[PDB]
Structure formats: structure tokens, C-alpha cells
Design a protein around this nucleic acid. Structure first.
Ligand SMILES: [Mg+2]
Ligand SMILES: [Mg+2]
Ligand SMILES: [Mg+2]
Ligand SMILES: [Mg+2]
Ligand SMILES: [Mg+2]
Ligand SMILES: [Mg+2]
Ligand SMILES: [Mg+2]
Ligand SMILES: [Mg+2]
Ligand SMILES: [Mg+2]
Ligand SMILES: [Mg+2]
Ligand SMILES: [Mg+2]
Ligand SMILES: [Mg+2]
Ligand SMILES: [Mg+2]
Ligand SMILES: [Mg+2]
Ligand SMILES: [Mg+2]
Length: 95
RNA sequence: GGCCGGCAUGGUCCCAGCCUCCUCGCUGGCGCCGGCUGGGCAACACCAUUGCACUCCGGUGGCGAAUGGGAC
């Protein structure tokens, strides 16, 4: 359902027909305005398809991105967003 | 994509057309029928999947495809 605040947002219900490189770029296009993005992780494997991790440098960015883009129609599908359950390695490798 | 068999089929060159998972080719292929067989999921389609990762990594399918004109 939902979890504790995090630098990283977990996005799913994404259109699975879209390729990894395009998907990453399109996600930057709509999410960059919430704050600096450290990385976007995408895989098309059987387990990880339809999903993305957007890693913000500051948690407040993640928070605003989550509230604002919940259900945003993206490649004809309503985007579902939550905080990631765990910190991404890029975040742990800092603080 | 490869090989073989049967039948049909005069040769060389030119132009145009058509076909596609298999160099979309600046020279790849394209008579009819039938059997054997290779590679790969890179793209595409379909099936399955709503999945919390930081390790690339589900499956199946097609190629069971494609002809006119001219010069000598
Ligand atoms: Mg990209
Ligand atoms: Mg990458
Ligand atoms: Mg997967
Ligand atoms: Mg033969
Ligand atoms: Mg005869
Ligand atoms: Mg015959
Ligand atoms: Mg002869
Ligand atoms: Mg003649
Ligand atoms: Mg020609
Ligand atoms: Mg034409
Ligand atoms: Mg064609
Ligand atoms: Mg047979
Ligand atoms: Mg986790
Ligand atoms: Mg085959
Ligand atoms: Mg002729």
C-alpha cells in the first residue's frame, strides 16, 4: 500500500511495451522539475518490467513527485507511485 | 538462414517489381511440389506476468515469404 518516506519513488503500472532507454528518458522529462535526479533504474526482465525507481537527491522532491504525479497518464496507463521500501545504493553510498 | 529429392525449365545482359526474425543489402532472395535441419530472442507480434530492484537473463511464433517487361 504505502511506506515510510524515501529518496527513491517506486513507480509501477508502467507500459511494458516501451523500451528501457526511452522509458528512462521520458521519466526524466516529467519528473526532473521536482528536483535533481541521481538516477532512474529500469529493467525489462520478467520480474521487473512495468516498474521504475526514480532516485531524487532530496526526499522532499520524492514527496512532491509522489503527491503530484499519482495516477498520471503515461503511455496511456495511469502511473502508480509509492516510496521505495529500501534505500537505493547510490543514496547509501553517500550518508 | 542451410542441405537434399522430384518435376518443370534454351543462354547472356538490362530495367522495373515483389518478399523478409536471418547483413533491408551499395547485389540478399523471389519456377512448382515435398522432406530434413541450423541460429537467435537483437527488433516485431502473441502468450504469460502488477512484479520493491540496485547481477544481463520467461516462453512461443515468422523465412509456411516473394515476377513482369526489354535488348541481344
Ligand atoms: Mg536512457
Ligand atoms: Mg543503464
Ligand atoms: Mg524482471
Ligand atoms: Mg533444389
Ligand atoms: Mg513434367
Ligand atoms: Mg513439376
Ligand atoms: Mg541448357
Ligand atoms: Mg525471346
Ligand atoms: Mg531488377
Ligand atoms: Mg516499387
Ligand atoms: Mg516488401
Ligand atoms: Mg514432414
Ligand atoms: Mg526491497
Ligand atoms: Mg525455422
Ligand atoms: Mg525478358
Amino acid at each position: 500500500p504505502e511506506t515510510r518516506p524515501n529518496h527513491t519513488i517506486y513507480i509501477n503500472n508502467l507500459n511494458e511495451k516501451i523500451k528501457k532507454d526511452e522509458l528512462k528518458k521520458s521519466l526524466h522529462a516529467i519528473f526532473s522539475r521536482f528536483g535533481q535526479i541521481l538516477d532512474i533504474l529500469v529493467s525489462r526482465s520478467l520480474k521487473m518490467r512495468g516498474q521504475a525507481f526514480v532516485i531524487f537527491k532530496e526526499v522532499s522532491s520524492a514527496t512532491n513527485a509522489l503527491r503530484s504525479m499519482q495516477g498520471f497518464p503515461f503511455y496511456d496507463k495511469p502511473m502508480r507511485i509509492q516510496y521505495a521500501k529500501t534505500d537505493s545504493d547510490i543514496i547509501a553510498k553517500m550518508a
